[PDB]
Amino acid sequence: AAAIGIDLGTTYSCVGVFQHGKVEIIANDQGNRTTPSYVAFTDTERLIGDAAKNQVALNPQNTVFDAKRLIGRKFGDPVVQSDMKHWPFQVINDGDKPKVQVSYKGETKAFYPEEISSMVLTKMKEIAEAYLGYPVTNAVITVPAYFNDSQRQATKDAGVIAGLNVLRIINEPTAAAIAYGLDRTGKGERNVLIFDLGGGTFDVSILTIDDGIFEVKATAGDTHLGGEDFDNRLVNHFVEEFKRKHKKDISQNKRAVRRLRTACQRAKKTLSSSTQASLEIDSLFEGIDFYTSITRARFEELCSDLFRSTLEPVEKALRDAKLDKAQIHDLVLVGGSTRIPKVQKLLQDFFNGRDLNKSINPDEAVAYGAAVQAAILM
Numbered sequence: 001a002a003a004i005g006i007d008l009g010t011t012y013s014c015v016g017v018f019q020h021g022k023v024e025i026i027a028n029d030q031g032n033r034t035t036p037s038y039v040a041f042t043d044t045e046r047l048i049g050d051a052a053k054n055q056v057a058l059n060p061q062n063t064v065f066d067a068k069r070l071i072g073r074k075f076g077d078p079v080v081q082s083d084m085k086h087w088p089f090q091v092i093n094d095g096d097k098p099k100v101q102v103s104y105k106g107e108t109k110a111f112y113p114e115e116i117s118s119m120v121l122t123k124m125k126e127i128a129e130a131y132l133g134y135p136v137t138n139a140v141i142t143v144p145a146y147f148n149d150s151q152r153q154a155t156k157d158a159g160v161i162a163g164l165n166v167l168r169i170i171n172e173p174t175a176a177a178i179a180y181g182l183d184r185t186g187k188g189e190r191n192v193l194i195f196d197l198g199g200g201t202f203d204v205s206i207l208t209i210d211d212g213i214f215e216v217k218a219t220a221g222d223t224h225l226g227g228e229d230f231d232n233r234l235v236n237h238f239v240e241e242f243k244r245k246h247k248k249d250i251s252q253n254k255r256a257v258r259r260l261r262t263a264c265q266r267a268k269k270t271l272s273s274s275t276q277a278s279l280e281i282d283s284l285f286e287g288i289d290f291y292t293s294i295t296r297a298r299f300e301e302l303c304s305d306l307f308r309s310t311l312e313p314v315e316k317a318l319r320d321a322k323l324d325k326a327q328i329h330d331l332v333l334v335g336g337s338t339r340i341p342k343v344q345k346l347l348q349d350f351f352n353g354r355d356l357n358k359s360i361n362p363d364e365a366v367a368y369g370a371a372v373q374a375a376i377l378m
């Protein structure tokens with residue numbers, strides 16, 4: 001039986017398996033090759049993944065997301081106390097550990113972060129089992145390089161709770177490097193830069209690889225910079241467009257804003273491969289249809305400062321590693337947001353025209369590498 005590799009993301013998770021000489025990134029029941037790290041509780045059922053995120057009658061208080069921001073932290077951790085202010089779900093204190101509190105089947109319940117993340121991992125396990133046609137019992141799971149012992153432990157515990165023997169916890173950037181076969185180099189140092197822009201976070205990592213041994217030389221980035229921030233620029237843009245056109249403010253109608261935000265995420269993805277996108281929402285506010293469009297160039301303007309801000313952390317990482325641009329051997333794109341053409345241009349220009357490694361869907365590279373390493377360890 002094959003073991004699986006799982007990228008347990010802040011916003012999207014991905015599962016792959018190595019068999020018959022090659023990695024298969026496994027699509028879920030809706031055909032999506034990555035799955036939202038969402039769990040929802042209703043009066044009748046628990047929903048995970050696409051079903052949780054896509055609720056037609058979504059209940060903000062009982063739909064949990066961002067558990068990765070809590071996992072392995074103390075309740076009194078200032079990161080937790082800050083993050084709590086912007087979530088619609090309740091976080092409580094159980095002996096200086098955080099728990100997320102919800103209503104389920106009519107009663108108030110609370111769950112540790114590693115419990116919420118185990119539900120996401122169970123979904124990923126099941127996605128794999130459907131494809132393989134047998135039970136999966138071993139996995140490699142990835143984490144950010146900056147994770148500490150407590151965060152790594154809680155992640156491993158989420159795996160155990162989901163019925164997985166965790167062969168190893170490995171760093172996300174190391175997994176992306178493995179996906180591209182960069183661990184296979186002989187003796188002699190090669191410097192690799194991983195540029196990772198996901199849904200919620202931005203991670204720059206510089207790795208030295210020598211005869212298959214990885215050293216983390218430098219890390220930089222921003223834990224509150226990702227695709228969702230580009231979403232929010234589009235939402236604010238269209239809220240102003242609706243005001244102009246209909247003389248109505250929709251900003252305080254939570255439902256209209258969620259429905260607009262979903263459509264902005266869909267348009268954004270489309271703008272990575274087309275130069276314009278149409279956005280059409282039936283009865284968005286007080287029965288008014290909102291049918292409009294957005295160009296790639298306009299989307300770029302709306303986000304220009306955010307896109308540009310990704311480069312100073314690259315500069316910083318290089319200084320910390322005591323390396324010049326020219327001394328990086330390989331540049332690897334990771335994270336869904338690096339599909340954005342403008343982001344690719346900025347990083348390529350900064351590196352004076354160097355090739356980017358982008359042949360593996362960037363939001364799949366970490367799971368791909370995890371799957372490769374899981375097979376080695378078996």
Ligand SMILES: Nc1ncnc2c1ncn2[C@@H]1O[C@H](COP(=O)(O)OP(=O)(O)OP(=O)(O)O)[C@@H](O)[C@H]1O
Pocket residue numbers: 007008009010011012013034197198199200201202226227228265268269270272334335336337338339340362363
């Ligand atoms: N083609 C695309 N163009 C632009 N953005 C995209 C595209 N495909 C996915 N995204 C965006 O990528 C983001 C998710 O990326 P990813 O799957 O790397 O998340 P992740 O692994 O959870 O990372 P993090 O923990 O940083 O959120 C979302 O904001 C999503 O809209």
Ligand SMILES: [Cl-]
Pocket residue numbers: 028029030049050127
């Ligand atoms: Cl599914």
Ligand SMILES: [Cl-]
Pocket residue numbers: 046047048049051052
């Ligand atoms: Cl479900």
Ligand SMILES: [Mg+2]
Pocket residue numbers: 009010144172198
């Ligand atoms: Mg990540």
Ligand code: NA
Pocket residue numbers: 007008009010012013014034363
């Ligand atoms: Na992911």
